[PDB]
């Protein structure tokens, strides 16, 4: 074997991402866990010499182990690795010298898209303020994202609408890539988001291309549902396995198109095979918006 594949992770950690860790003020906590949080913060001289930048830190807590550690680490050398894209949380800089690492990620000001649904749900229109035209790139972005992801052969294991974040521009980003893997033929595995989940991810743990294309078509009915939680009145127990395993699906949400919820069923097909490929995704959904 003269030939191998590069493994990301195994790359060094490149110093040019490294930041002063005294040159950032940390402000409002965006999200906490157990394991650590990610806050707010202001960057001086981050892209410019003498310009604050608003950022995103992502920190462990000391009370951590060492797996936990080295996988703050993986998610570092997986965004180097991947490079820069428009619908990406992008990596800024990282905090590696001496102290806890710290990751500086792009901020997005207006968050995680399944709150911002829930916010505009009130007030939604779909032809006249969050609009139908708005749904349509949403989900236009975000599989081109994913479709980046997929070309770098990586995976996300947690798509999912509160996982992608909304800035400026109504640029959607996805983020949270500590559970993204690099798959060269799929990822073998912690709570973990069932709801979201390809039936063979929860019955073999196998996480596949395909298993993230199946939580993009969850996320299609995140989107379309104007937040509402996946399997509505549905707990997940016993029954709730057997009903998946059989075949059950969620019906078309109310505005959905009858073209997206094709692809939420396609999406949802119990034939890893027969799912789209995100590359596909994206040429449908493009079609769909230049005939709208
Ligand atoms: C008005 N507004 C604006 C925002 C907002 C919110 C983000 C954001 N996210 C915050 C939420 N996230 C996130 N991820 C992972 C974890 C943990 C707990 N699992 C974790 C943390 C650290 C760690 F070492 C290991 C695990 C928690 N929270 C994703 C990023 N990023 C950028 N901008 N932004 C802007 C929210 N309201």
Same mark, same amino acid.
């Given at each position: 074997?003269?030939?191998?594949?590069?493994?990301?992770?195994?790359?060094?950690?490149?110093?040019?991402?490294?930041?002063?860790?005294?040159?950032?003020?940390?402000?409002?906590?965006? #999200?906490?866990?157990?394991?650590?949080?990610?806050?707010?913060?202001?960057?001086?001289?981050?892209?410019?010499?003498?310009?604050?930048?608003?950022?995103?830190?992502?920190?462990?807590?000391?009370?951590? =182990?060492?797996?936990?550690?080295?996988?703050?680490?993986?998610?570092?050398?997986?965004?180097?690795?991947? $490079?820069? =894209?428009?619908?990406?949380?992008?990596?800024? $800089?990282?905090?590696?010298?001496?102290?806890?690492?710290?990751?500086?990620?792009?901020?997005?000001?207006? #968050?995680?898209?399944?709150?911002?649904?829930?916010?505009?749900?009130?007030?939604?229109?779909?032809?006249?303020?969050?609009?139908?035209? =708005?749904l349509l790139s949403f989900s236009y972005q975000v599989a081109?994202?994913?479709?980046?992801?997929?070309?770098?052969?990586?995976?996300?294991?947690?798509?999912?609408?509160?996982?992608?974040?909304?800035?400026?521009?109504?640029?959607?980003?996805?983020?949270?890539? #500590?559970?993204?893997?690099?798959?060269?033929?799929?990822?073998?595995?912690?709570?973990?988001?069932?709801?979201?989940?390809?039936?063979?991810?929860?019955?073999?743990?196998?996480?596949?291309?395909?298993?993230?294309?199946?939580?993009y #078509?969850?996320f299609l009915?995140?989107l379309f549902?104007?937040?509402?939680?996946?399997?509505?009145?549905?707990?997940?127990?016993?029954?709730?396995?057997?009903?998946?395993?059989?075949?059950?699906?969620?019906?078309?949400?109310?505005?959905?198109?009858?073209?997206m919820?094709?692809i939420?069923?396609?999406?949802?097909?119990?034939?890893?095979?027969?799912?789209?490929?995100?590359?596909?995704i994206?040429?449908?959904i493009?079609?769909?918006?230049?005939?709208?």
């Amino acid at each position: 074997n003269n030939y191998s594949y590069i493994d990301p992770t195994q790359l060094p950690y490149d110093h040019k991402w490294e930041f002063p860790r005294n040159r950032l003020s940390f402000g409002k906590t965006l #999200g906490a866990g157990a394991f650590g949080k990610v806050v707010e913060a202001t960057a001086q001289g981050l892209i410019k010499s003498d310009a604050a930048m608003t950022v995103a830190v992502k920190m462990l807590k000391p009370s951590a =182990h060492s797996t936990e550690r080295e996988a703050l680490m993986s998610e570092l050398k997986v965004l180097s690795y991947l $490079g820069n =894209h428009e619908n990406i949380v992008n990596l800024l $800089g990282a905090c590696t010298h001496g102290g806890p690492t710290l990751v500086i990620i792009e901020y997005c000001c207006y #968050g995680d898209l399944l709150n911002f649904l829930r916010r505009k749900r009130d007030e939604f229109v779909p032809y006249k303020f969050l609009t139908l035209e =708005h749904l349509l790139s949403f989900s236009y972005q975000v599989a081109k994202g994913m479709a980046f992801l997929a070309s770098k052969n990586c995976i996300h294991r947690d798509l999912a609408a509160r996982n992608i974040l909304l800035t400026h521009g109504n640029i959607t980003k996805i983020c949270d890539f #500590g559970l993204a893997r690099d798959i060269k033929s799929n990822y073998v595995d912690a709570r973990l988001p069932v709801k979201w989940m390809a039936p063979e991810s929860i019955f073999n743990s196998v996480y596949t291309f395909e298993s993230d294309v199946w939580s993009y #078509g969850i996320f299609l009915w995140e989107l379309f549902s104007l937040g509402s939680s996946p399997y509505p009145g549905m707990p997940v127990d016993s029954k709730f396995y057997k009903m998946i395993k059989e075949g059950f699906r969620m019906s078309s949400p109310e505005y959905a198109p009858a073209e997206m919820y094709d692809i939420m069923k396609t999406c949802w097909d119990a034939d890893p095979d027969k799912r789209p490929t995100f590359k596909q995704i994206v040429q449908d959904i493009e079609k769909q918006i230049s005939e709208s």
